[PDB]
Amino acid sequence: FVATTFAFX
Amino acid sequence: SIPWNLERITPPRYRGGSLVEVYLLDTSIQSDHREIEGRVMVTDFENVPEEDASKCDSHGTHLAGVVSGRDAGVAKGASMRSLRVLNCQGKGTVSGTLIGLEFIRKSQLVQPVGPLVVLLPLAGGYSRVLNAACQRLARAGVVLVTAAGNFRDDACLYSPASAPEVITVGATNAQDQPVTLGTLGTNFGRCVDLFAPGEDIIGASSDCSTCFVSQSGTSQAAAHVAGIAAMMLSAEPELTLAELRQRLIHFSAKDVINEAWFPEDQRVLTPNLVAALPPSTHGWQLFCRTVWSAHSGPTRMATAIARCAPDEELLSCSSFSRSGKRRGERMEAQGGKLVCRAHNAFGGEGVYAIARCCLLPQANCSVHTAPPAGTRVHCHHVLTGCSSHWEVEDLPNQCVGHREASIHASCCHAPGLECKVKEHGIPQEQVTVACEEGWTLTGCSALPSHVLGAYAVDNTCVVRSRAVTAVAICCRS
Amino acid sequence: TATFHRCAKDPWRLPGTYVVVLKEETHLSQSERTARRLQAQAARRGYLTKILHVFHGLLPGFLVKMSGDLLELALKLPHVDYIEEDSSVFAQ
C-alpha cells in the first residue's frame, strides 16, 4: 500500500 | 517467477491487444521505462488542478505497466495512449475528466482505428455529468473500464464507478479475498461488475528506468480487466459491450470470494467473480447474466425496474425484499423491449427487480398473463421464466401462482434451445437448486411458507424465506 | 425545469466552477451563444465570469468560472438541462 493511491498514508 | 496476479487470471486450459488501443487517464507517466517504452504514446493532453518528480508519475507508470508491460503486463502487445488528468498529488477534477473523454472522442472521429478501451483509474463522489458522459461515450461504441473505489463502501455512490454501461472492477488479494486495510478497502455492491487481483501487484516503477514496485488498488484491478478486454477484442473484434461483458462474467472464477467480508445487505448484490482470461477451448453457447435494479425506495406505489442491453433478451424476472413486504414482479413492454418491474407493498422499505438478461439471437419472445383465478398459464414454445404479482396486501411449460395473484410466463421461440425444469424443496432461511454443468440458468422462482425473494446466482437458483420449494429453469443448445 | 447538483461529500466540492449542461440536441453554435449570454447577463450585474471550455462531442455545454449567486440566473438560460458544481477525483 503506497501513498500515491488514495486514501492510503 | 510468474507474478501471482498474472497466474491467477490464467485459465485452467491455455495456449495480445495489438489491433486494439487502450487510452489511459492518469498522472503523467515515465514513458521511457523499459516495461512500456515504444508502447505508450503520451498525447500531452493535460488538464489537472494545481498542487495544494518520481512521485508525480508513479501511479500512472505502474498502471501503464500492468496493462502492457513486456515483463509484468496483462496484454503485453497493446498500444496505449495517455492523457494527464491527475496532478502530482493524485488529484484531478470532474471537469478535467470530462474534457479528456471529449478529447478521446474527437481523436477517434479524426483518425479512426479499431476497437478502443478507456481505463479510468480514478473516482470521486456520485456525479451526474460524469456518469452521463461515460454513458454517452459508451453508446458511441467505446469500452470503458473503471475502478470500483477504495473506501470499503457501496460503489454506487462514486463516479465513474456507478456510471451506466461502464465495466466497474473491485480488487481481490492473493487469497481471493476483498482487499481490506483498516476502514479502507475495495468498494462493493451492485454497481461492481467483477473483481480482479488488486493487492501487491508488481509493475513498472518510475524510480528508475528498470525498477519495479508492488502497488495495490482497485485501479490495479481494473487494469487487469482492461488488458483482458483488449485481448478479447483482438480475437473477436466485433463484440458488442453486452457480448464482451457476458464473456468477462462467463470466464471469471466463480463463488471464490468469501462474502463474509461484505456488510450483510451487500452480499446479495455483489457479484462473486474474479476475472480470468478465456481458455483455449473458446460453437454457439447460451450466455445469461443477472441484473439487480436500484432499490425501489419506500413509497407505497414504488416500483423498481431492471433492464437488459439492447441486444439482450429478458428471459426471466424476479424480485427480492429484506422485510418480505412485497407485491411481486411482472414483465412489461417499454419502447418495444421487455423490462422487469417489481412492486413494493404498503409499508415496505422497498424492493429490487432482478432481471435475467441473455444473448439469444433469432429469438422471438412473448409474455402470457393470467389474472387471479390457483392461477396458471403456459406457453401454447419454451418456457424460460415465471413471474407473479398481486394487488392485495396479504394472502407442460406451465407457471403456477397464488390464487389471488397474476401469473406471467416468459415464452420464447428458439429453434435449437432445449430447456428443463429442476425442483428442490425442504422444511429454512435459504433453499437452493442448481442447473447441471453445461446448462444455463434462465429463470428462478419459488413455488407458492413466506418468501423474501428469489434470484439467480450464476447458475444456481436461490430462494429466501422468513415446505418451501425452489424452481430452476435451465437451457442449452 | 432545470436542476442544480453538487457533490454530497462536502470536502470534495470545488465551488466557484460549474459545468453547465445543455439539452442533448443542442448544437455547438447554440452552446457558444448561451455562454456569451451568461457572461453578458452576469456582467450587467457586476459579476466577472470566465468561459473555460465549450463542450461538444459527447455532451453539449460549457465550463464557467463564476460566483454561485448566478445559479438561479444560469438555470434560466435557454437550452439548459442541468448544472453541476465541479468536484475532485482521486487516483484509485
mmCIF file of N, CA and C in Angstrom, chain B residues 123-229:
data_model
loop_
_atom_site.group_PDB
_atom_site.id
_atom_site.type_symbol
_atom_site.label_atom_id
_atom_site.label_comp_id
_atom_site.label_asym_id
_atom_site.label_seq_id
_atom_site.Cartn_x
_atom_site.Cartn_y
_atom_site.Cartn_z
ATOM 1 N N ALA B 123 -11.706 7.917 -9.046
ATOM 2 C CA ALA B 123 -13.078 8.052 -8.592
ATOM 3 C C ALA B 123 -13.232 9.347 -7.817
ATOM 4 N N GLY B 124 -14.473 9.816 -7.761
ATOM 5 C CA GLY B 124 -14.894 10.797 -6.784
ATOM 6 C C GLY B 124 -16.295 10.413 -6.359
ATOM 7 N N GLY B 125 -17.031 11.318 -5.718
ATOM 8 C CA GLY B 125 -18.415 11.040 -5.388
ATOM 9 C C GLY B 125 -19.308 10.927 -6.625
ATOM 10 N N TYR B 126 -20.547 10.482 -6.388
ATOM 11 C CA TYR B 126 -21.522 10.345 -7.462
ATOM 12 C C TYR B 126 -21.629 11.661 -8.205
ATOM 13 N N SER B 127 -21.577 11.585 -9.531
ATOM 14 C CA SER B 127 -21.609 12.761 -10.395
ATOM 15 C C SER B 127 -22.545 12.478 -11.556
ATOM 16 N N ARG B 128 -23.568 13.312 -11.702
ATOM 17 C CA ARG B 128 -24.485 13.153 -12.813
ATOM 18 C C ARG B 128 -23.787 13.417 -14.147
ATOM 19 N N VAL B 129 -22.992 14.485 -14.224
ATOM 20 C CA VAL B 129 -22.431 14.836 -15.519
ATOM 21 C C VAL B 129 -21.350 13.840 -15.915
ATOM 22 N N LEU B 130 -20.533 13.390 -14.956
ATOM 23 C CA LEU B 130 -19.510 12.419 -15.312
ATOM 24 C C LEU B 130 -20.134 11.096 -15.721
ATOM 25 N N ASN B 131 -21.235 10.700 -15.075
ATOM 26 C CA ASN B 131 -21.846 9.427 -15.445
ATOM 27 C C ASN B 131 -22.514 9.533 -16.813
ATOM 28 N N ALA B 132 -23.147 10.669 -17.096
ATOM 29 C CA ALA B 132 -23.754 10.865 -18.406
ATOM 30 C C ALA B 132 -22.716 10.812 -19.523
ATOM 31 N N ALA B 133 -21.550 11.440 -19.313
ATOM 32 C CA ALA B 133 -20.519 11.476 -20.351
ATOM 33 C C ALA B 133 -19.957 10.087 -20.629
ATOM 34 N N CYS B 134 -19.716 9.297 -19.581
ATOM 35 C CA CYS B 134 -19.316 7.907 -19.777
ATOM 36 C C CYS B 134 -20.382 7.131 -20.536
ATOM 37 N N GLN B 135 -21.648 7.270 -20.122
ATOM 38 C CA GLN B 135 -22.720 6.576 -20.827
ATOM 39 C C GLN B 135 -22.712 6.937 -22.300
ATOM 40 N N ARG B 136 -22.624 8.234 -22.596
ATOM 41 C CA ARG B 136 -22.620 8.682 -23.982
ATOM 42 C C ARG B 136 -21.410 8.140 -24.737
ATOM 43 N N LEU B 137 -20.226 8.177 -24.124
ATOM 44 C CA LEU B 137 -19.075 7.629 -24.836
ATOM 45 C C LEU B 137 -19.209 6.122 -25.024
ATOM 46 N N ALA B 138 -19.927 5.438 -24.125
ATOM 47 C CA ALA B 138 -20.160 4.014 -24.324
ATOM 48 C C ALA B 138 -21.101 3.772 -25.494
ATOM 49 N N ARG B 139 -22.187 4.539 -25.597
ATOM 50 C CA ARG B 139 -23.108 4.333 -26.711
ATOM 51 C C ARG B 139 -22.484 4.680 -28.050
ATOM 52 N N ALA B 140 -21.472 5.535 -28.079
ATOM 53 C CA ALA B 140 -20.797 5.732 -29.352
ATOM 54 C C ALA B 140 -19.931 4.533 -29.755
ATOM 55 N N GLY B 141 -19.764 3.518 -28.905
ATOM 56 C CA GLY B 141 -19.042 2.309 -29.258
ATOM 57 C C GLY B 141 -17.739 2.044 -28.528
ATOM 58 N N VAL B 142 -17.375 2.854 -27.535
ATOM 59 C CA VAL B 142 -16.116 2.723 -26.805
ATOM 60 C C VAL B 142 -16.350 1.977 -25.489
ATOM 61 N N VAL B 143 -15.411 1.109 -25.130
ATOM 62 C CA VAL B 143 -15.479 0.330 -23.894
ATOM 63 C C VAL B 143 -14.763 1.081 -22.784
ATOM 64 N N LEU B 144 -15.425 1.238 -21.647
ATOM 65 C CA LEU B 144 -14.850 1.936 -20.512
ATOM 66 C C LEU B 144 -14.669 0.965 -19.352
ATOM 67 N N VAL B 145 -13.481 0.982 -18.742
ATOM 68 C CA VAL B 145 -13.167 0.171 -17.569
ATOM 69 C C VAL B 145 -12.788 1.101 -16.422
ATOM 70 N N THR B 146 -13.419 0.905 -15.270
ATOM 71 C CA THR B 146 -13.323 1.870 -14.192
ATOM 72 C C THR B 146 -13.094 1.169 -12.857
ATOM 73 N N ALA B 147 -12.349 1.844 -11.986
ATOM 74 C CA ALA B 147 -12.114 1.345 -10.647
ATOM 75 C C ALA B 147 -13.396 1.371 -9.847
ATOM 76 N N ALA B 148 -13.523 0.416 -8.930
ATOM 77 C CA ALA B 148 -14.701 0.386 -8.073
ATOM 78 C C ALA B 148 -14.645 1.479 -7.025
ATOM 79 N N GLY B 149 -13.450 1.812 -6.560
ATOM 80 C CA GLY B 149 -13.210 2.743 -5.477
ATOM 81 C C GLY B 149 -12.689 2.054 -4.218
ATOM 82 N N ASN B 150 -11.944 2.819 -3.421
ATOM 83 C CA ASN B 150 -11.062 2.275 -2.399
ATOM 84 C C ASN B 150 -11.533 2.541 -0.971
ATOM 85 N N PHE B 151 -12.822 2.785 -0.756
ATOM 86 C CA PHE B 151 -13.285 3.306 0.523
ATOM 87 C C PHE B 151 -14.116 2.313 1.319
ATOM 88 N N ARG B 152 -14.123 1.042 0.923
ATOM 89 C CA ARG B 152 -14.899 -0.007 1.588
ATOM 90 C C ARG B 152 -16.371 0.401 1.749
ATOM 91 N N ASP B 153 -17.010 0.661 0.613
ATOM 92 C CA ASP B 153 -18.273 1.371 0.574
ATOM 93 C C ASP B 153 -19.072 0.865 -0.622
ATOM 94 N N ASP B 154 -20.335 1.259 -0.672
ATOM 95 C CA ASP B 154 -21.180 0.951 -1.814
ATOM 96 C C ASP B 154 -20.651 1.698 -3.036
ATOM 97 N N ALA B 155 -20.254 0.955 -4.075
ATOM 98 C CA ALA B 155 -19.674 1.571 -5.259
ATOM 99 C C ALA B 155 -20.654 2.464 -6.003
ATOM 100 N N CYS B 156 -21.951 2.332 -5.755
ATOM 101 C CA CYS B 156 -22.885 3.168 -6.500
ATOM 102 C C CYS B 156 -22.871 4.615 -6.037
ATOM 103 N N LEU B 157 -22.113 4.949 -4.996
ATOM 104 C CA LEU B 157 -22.018 6.325 -4.535
ATOM 105 C C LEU B 157 -20.812 7.055 -5.098
ATOM 106 N N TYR B 158 -20.133 6.490 -6.097
ATOM 107 C CA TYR B 158 -18.916 7.090 -6.630
ATOM 108 C C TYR B 158 -18.960 7.092 -8.151
ATOM 109 N N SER B 159 -18.152 7.957 -8.746
ATOM 110 C CA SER B 159 -18.124 8.028 -10.199
ATOM 111 C C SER B 159 -16.686 8.028 -10.692
ATOM 112 N N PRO B 160 -16.422 7.420 -11.836
ATOM 113 C CA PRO B 160 -17.389 6.809 -12.770
ATOM 114 C C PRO B 160 -17.840 5.389 -12.413
ATOM 115 N N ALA B 161 -17.481 4.926 -11.212
ATOM 116 C CA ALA B 161 -17.806 3.570 -10.777
ATOM 117 C C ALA B 161 -19.270 3.226 -10.992
ATOM 118 N N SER B 162 -20.163 4.126 -10.617
ATOM 119 C CA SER B 162 -21.589 3.861 -10.705
ATOM 120 C C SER B 162 -22.170 4.137 -12.076
ATOM 121 N N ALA B 163 -21.364 4.526 -13.054
ATOM 122 C CA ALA B 163 -21.915 5.002 -14.312
ATOM 123 C C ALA B 163 -22.550 3.851 -15.077
ATOM 124 N N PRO B 164 -23.615 4.115 -15.833
ATOM 125 C CA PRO B 164 -24.215 3.043 -16.625
ATOM 126 C C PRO B 164 -23.342 2.720 -17.818
ATOM 127 N N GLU B 165 -23.182 1.421 -18.067
ATOM 128 C CA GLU B 165 -22.584 0.860 -19.272
ATOM 129 C C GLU B 165 -21.079 0.995 -19.242
ATOM 130 N N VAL B 166 -20.521 1.149 -18.079
ATOM 131 C CA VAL B 166 -19.095 1.071 -17.827
ATOM 132 C C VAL B 166 -18.843 -0.234 -17.093
ATOM 133 N N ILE B 167 -17.652 -0.785 -17.254
ATOM 134 C CA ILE B 167 -17.271 -2.006 -16.561
ATOM 135 C C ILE B 167 -16.529 -1.601 -15.298
ATOM 136 N N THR B 168 -17.123 -1.880 -14.143
ATOM 137 C CA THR B 168 -16.581 -1.464 -12.860
ATOM 138 C C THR B 168 -16.007 -2.674 -12.137
ATOM 139 N N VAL B 169 -14.792 -2.518 -11.607
ATOM 140 C CA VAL B 169 -13.937 -3.623 -11.174
ATOM 141 C C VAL B 169 -13.412 -3.372 -9.768
ATOM 142 N N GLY B 170 -13.765 -4.259 -8.825
ATOM 143 C CA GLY B 170 -13.193 -4.251 -7.491
ATOM 144 C C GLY B 170 -11.931 -5.097 -7.428
ATOM 145 N N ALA B 171 -11.311 -5.118 -6.244
ATOM 146 C CA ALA B 171 -9.991 -5.724 -6.081
ATOM 147 C C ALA B 171 -10.018 -6.855 -5.063
ATOM 148 N N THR B 172 -9.304 -7.940 -5.390
ATOM 149 C CA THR B 172 -9.096 -9.074 -4.505
ATOM 150 C C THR B 172 -7.608 -9.343 -4.322
ATOM 151 N N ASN B 173 -7.279 -10.099 -3.281
ATOM 152 C CA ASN B 173 -5.885 -10.352 -2.956
ATOM 153 C C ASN B 173 -5.491 -11.787 -3.308
ATOM 154 N N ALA B 174 -4.297 -12.185 -2.878
ATOM 155 C CA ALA B 174 -3.783 -13.472 -3.319
ATOM 156 C C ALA B 174 -4.620 -14.625 -2.790
ATOM 157 N N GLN B 175 -5.321 -14.428 -1.667
ATOM 158 C CA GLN B 175 -6.264 -15.404 -1.137
ATOM 159 C C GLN B 175 -7.669 -15.263 -1.717
ATOM 160 N N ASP B 176 -7.830 -14.543 -2.827
ATOM 161 C CA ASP B 176 -9.141 -14.339 -3.434
ATOM 162 C C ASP B 176 -10.106 -13.637 -2.482
ATOM 163 N N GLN B 177 -9.585 -12.825 -1.581
ATOM 164 C CA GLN B 177 -10.441 -12.112 -0.655
ATOM 165 C C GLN B 177 -10.511 -10.632 -1.008
ATOM 166 N N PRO B 178 -11.576 -9.941 -0.611
ATOM 167 C CA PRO B 178 -11.654 -8.494 -0.869
ATOM 168 C C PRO B 178 -10.555 -7.757 -0.125
ATOM 169 N N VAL B 179 -9.831 -6.905 -0.848
ATOM 170 C CA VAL B 179 -8.779 -6.145 -0.210
ATOM 171 C C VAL B 179 -9.410 -5.322 0.889
ATOM 172 N N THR B 180 -8.782 -5.339 2.070
ATOM 173 C CA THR B 180 -9.213 -4.545 3.215
ATOM 174 C C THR B 180 -7.974 -4.031 3.937
ATOM 175 N N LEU B 181 -7.962 -2.732 4.257
ATOM 176 C CA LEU B 181 -6.875 -2.104 5.007
ATOM 177 C C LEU B 181 -7.519 -1.147 6.009
ATOM 178 N N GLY B 182 -7.749 -1.652 7.218
ATOM 179 C CA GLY B 182 -8.491 -0.891 8.209
ATOM 180 C C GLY B 182 -9.902 -0.626 7.730
ATOM 181 N N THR B 183 -10.333 0.624 7.872
ATOM 182 C CA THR B 183 -11.628 1.044 7.356
ATOM 183 C C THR B 183 -11.593 1.336 5.854
ATOM 184 N N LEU B 184 -10.483 1.024 5.189
ATOM 185 C CA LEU B 184 -10.332 1.168 3.750
ATOM 186 C C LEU B 184 -10.292 -0.206 3.090
ATOM 187 N N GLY B 185 -10.486 -0.218 1.782
ATOM 188 C CA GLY B 185 -10.560 -1.468 1.047
ATOM 189 C C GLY B 185 -11.426 -1.308 -0.181
ATOM 190 N N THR B 186 -11.621 -2.425 -0.877
ATOM 191 C CA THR B 186 -12.374 -2.391 -2.128
ATOM 192 C C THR B 186 -13.849 -2.083 -1.886
ATOM 193 N N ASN B 187 -14.396 -1.183 -2.700
ATOM 194 C CA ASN B 187 -15.835 -0.991 -2.722
ATOM 195 C C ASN B 187 -16.528 -2.268 -3.179
ATOM 196 N N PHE B 188 -17.852 -2.277 -3.048
ATOM 197 C CA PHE B 188 -18.653 -3.459 -3.337
ATOM 198 C C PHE B 188 -20.016 -3.009 -3.853
ATOM 199 N N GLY B 189 -20.941 -3.954 -3.940
ATOM 200 C CA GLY B 189 -22.311 -3.636 -4.278
ATOM 201 C C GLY B 189 -22.672 -3.964 -5.715
ATOM 202 N N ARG B 190 -23.911 -3.625 -6.060
ATOM 203 C CA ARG B 190 -24.470 -4.000 -7.349
ATOM 204 C C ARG B 190 -23.911 -3.196 -8.515
ATOM 205 N N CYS B 191 -23.186 -2.111 -8.261
ATOM 206 C CA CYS B 191 -22.537 -1.395 -9.349
ATOM 207 C C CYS B 191 -21.147 -1.943 -9.660
ATOM 208 N N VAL B 192 -20.696 -2.956 -8.938
ATOM 209 C CA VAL B 192 -19.425 -3.608 -9.233
ATOM 210 C C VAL B 192 -19.721 -4.758 -10.180
ATOM 211 N N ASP B 193 -19.025 -4.803 -11.308
ATOM 212 C CA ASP B 193 -19.281 -5.885 -12.251
ATOM 213 C C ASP B 193 -18.521 -7.153 -11.887
ATOM 214 N N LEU B 194 -17.249 -7.024 -11.519
ATOM 215 C CA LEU B 194 -16.411 -8.167 -11.181
ATOM 216 C C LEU B 194 -15.196 -7.676 -10.408
ATOM 217 N N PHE B 195 -14.427 -8.632 -9.902
ATOM 218 C CA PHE B 195 -13.229 -8.344 -9.130
ATOM 219 C C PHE B 195 -12.024 -8.850 -9.899
ATOM 220 N N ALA B 196 -10.858 -8.362 -9.533
ATOM 221 C CA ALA B 196 -9.631 -8.824 -10.164
ATOM 222 C C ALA B 196 -8.505 -8.655 -9.160
ATOM 223 N N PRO B 197 -7.342 -9.246 -9.414
ATOM 224 C CA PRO B 197 -6.225 -9.049 -8.485
ATOM 225 C C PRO B 197 -5.898 -7.569 -8.341
ATOM 226 N N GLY B 198 -5.839 -7.105 -7.097
ATOM 227 C CA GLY B 198 -5.572 -5.705 -6.850
ATOM 228 C C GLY B 198 -4.752 -5.431 -5.608
ATOM 229 N N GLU B 199 -4.099 -6.457 -5.068
ATOM 230 C CA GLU B 199 -3.234 -6.318 -3.905
ATOM 231 C C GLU B 199 -1.851 -6.833 -4.257
ATOM 232 N N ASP B 200 -0.822 -6.021 -4.004
ATOM 233 C CA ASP B 200 0.552 -6.470 -4.188
ATOM 234 C C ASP B 200 0.780 -6.898 -5.642
ATOM 235 N N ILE B 201 0.584 -5.945 -6.545
ATOM 236 C CA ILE B 201 0.718 -6.172 -7.980
ATOM 237 C C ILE B 201 2.042 -5.559 -8.427
ATOM 238 N N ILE B 202 2.976 -6.396 -8.881
ATOM 239 C CA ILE B 202 4.276 -5.895 -9.302
ATOM 240 C C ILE B 202 4.144 -5.246 -10.679
ATOM 241 N N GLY B 203 4.763 -4.084 -10.840
ATOM 242 C CA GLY B 203 4.634 -3.341 -12.077
ATOM 243 C C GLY B 203 5.756 -2.335 -12.166
ATOM 244 N N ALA B 204 5.762 -1.597 -13.273
ATOM 245 C CA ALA B 204 6.856 -0.686 -13.586
ATOM 246 C C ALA B 204 6.945 0.451 -12.574
ATOM 247 N N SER B 205 8.152 0.695 -12.068
ATOM 248 C CA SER B 205 8.405 1.757 -11.105
ATOM 249 C C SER B 205 9.114 2.934 -11.761
ATOM 250 N N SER B 206 8.633 4.136 -11.492
ATOM 251 C CA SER B 206 9.246 5.321 -12.070
ATOM 252 C C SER B 206 10.471 5.791 -11.284
ATOM 253 N N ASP B 207 10.900 5.032 -10.274
ATOM 254 C CA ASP B 207 12.122 5.386 -9.560
ATOM 255 C C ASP B 207 13.336 5.296 -10.466
ATOM 256 N N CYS B 208 13.415 4.254 -11.291
ATOM 257 C CA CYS B 208 14.488 4.145 -12.270
ATOM 258 C C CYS B 208 13.935 3.467 -13.512
ATOM 259 N N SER B 209 14.649 3.611 -14.625
ATOM 260 C CA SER B 209 14.102 3.151 -15.895
ATOM 261 C C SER B 209 13.971 1.641 -15.976
ATOM 262 N N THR B 210 14.447 0.899 -14.971
ATOM 263 C CA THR B 210 14.337 -0.555 -14.970
ATOM 264 C C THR B 210 13.775 -1.092 -13.662
ATOM 265 N N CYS B 211 13.342 -0.221 -12.758
ATOM 266 C CA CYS B 211 12.896 -0.633 -11.442
ATOM 267 C C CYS B 211 11.450 -1.156 -11.471
ATOM 268 N N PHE B 212 11.066 -1.853 -10.386
ATOM 269 C CA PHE B 212 9.738 -2.441 -10.217
ATOM 270 C C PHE B 212 9.276 -2.272 -8.780
ATOM 271 N N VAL B 213 7.973 -2.016 -8.610
ATOM 272 C CA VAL B 213 7.362 -1.863 -7.297
ATOM 273 C C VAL B 213 6.036 -2.611 -7.274
ATOM 274 N N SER B 214 5.573 -2.936 -6.058
ATOM 275 C CA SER B 214 4.261 -3.544 -5.828
ATOM 276 C C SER B 214 3.282 -2.499 -5.308
ATOM 277 N N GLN B 215 2.199 -2.281 -6.042
ATOM 278 C CA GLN B 215 1.151 -1.374 -5.607
ATOM 279 C C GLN B 215 -0.150 -2.154 -5.480
ATOM 280 N N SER B 216 -1.089 -1.590 -4.711
ATOM 281 C CA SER B 216 -2.435 -2.135 -4.546
ATOM 282 C C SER B 216 -3.481 -1.044 -4.743
ATOM 283 N N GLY B 217 -4.574 -1.407 -5.399
ATOM 284 C CA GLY B 217 -5.721 -0.530 -5.531
ATOM 285 C C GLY B 217 -6.758 -1.208 -6.387
ATOM 286 N N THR B 218 -7.922 -0.566 -6.488
ATOM 287 C CA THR B 218 -8.889 -1.016 -7.485
ATOM 288 C C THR B 218 -8.497 -0.603 -8.897
ATOM 289 N N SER B 219 -7.612 0.378 -9.035
ATOM 290 C CA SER B 219 -7.047 0.697 -10.337
ATOM 291 C C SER B 219 -6.235 -0.470 -10.878
ATOM 292 N N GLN B 220 -5.328 -1.011 -10.065
ATOM 293 C CA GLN B 220 -4.610 -2.198 -10.499
ATOM 294 C C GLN B 220 -5.591 -3.259 -10.966
ATOM 295 N N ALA B 221 -6.699 -3.421 -10.239
ATOM 296 C CA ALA B 221 -7.670 -4.454 -10.583
ATOM 297 C C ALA B 221 -8.384 -4.135 -11.894
ATOM 298 N N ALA B 222 -8.783 -2.874 -12.086
ATOM 299 C CA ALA B 222 -9.382 -2.503 -13.362
ATOM 300 C C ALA B 222 -8.376 -2.623 -14.506
ATOM 301 N N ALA B 223 -7.088 -2.433 -14.228
ATOM 302 C CA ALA B 223 -6.082 -2.569 -15.277
ATOM 303 C C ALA B 223 -5.970 -4.010 -15.785
ATOM 304 N N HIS B 224 -6.180 -5.015 -14.923
ATOM 305 C CA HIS B 224 -6.182 -6.397 -15.406
ATOM 306 C C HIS B 224 -7.358 -6.634 -16.350
ATOM 307 N N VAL B 225 -8.501 -6.033 -16.042
ATOM 308 C CA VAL B 225 -9.696 -6.255 -16.840
ATOM 309 C C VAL B 225 -9.597 -5.508 -18.167
ATOM 310 N N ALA B 226 -9.008 -4.308 -18.156
ATOM 311 C CA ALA B 226 -8.752 -3.599 -19.405
ATOM 312 C C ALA B 226 -7.848 -4.415 -20.323
ATOM 313 N N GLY B 227 -6.793 -5.013 -19.773
ATOM 314 C CA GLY B 227 -5.925 -5.835 -20.596
ATOM 315 C C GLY B 227 -6.610 -7.097 -21.087
ATOM 316 N N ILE B 228 -7.394 -7.742 -20.220
ATOM 317 C CA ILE B 228 -8.161 -8.893 -20.680
ATOM 318 C C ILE B 228 -9.098 -8.473 -21.798
ATOM 319 N N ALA B 229 -9.791 -7.338 -21.610
ATOM 320 C CA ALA B 229 -10.727 -6.860 -22.625
ATOM 321 C C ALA B 229 -10.022 -6.586 -23.956
#
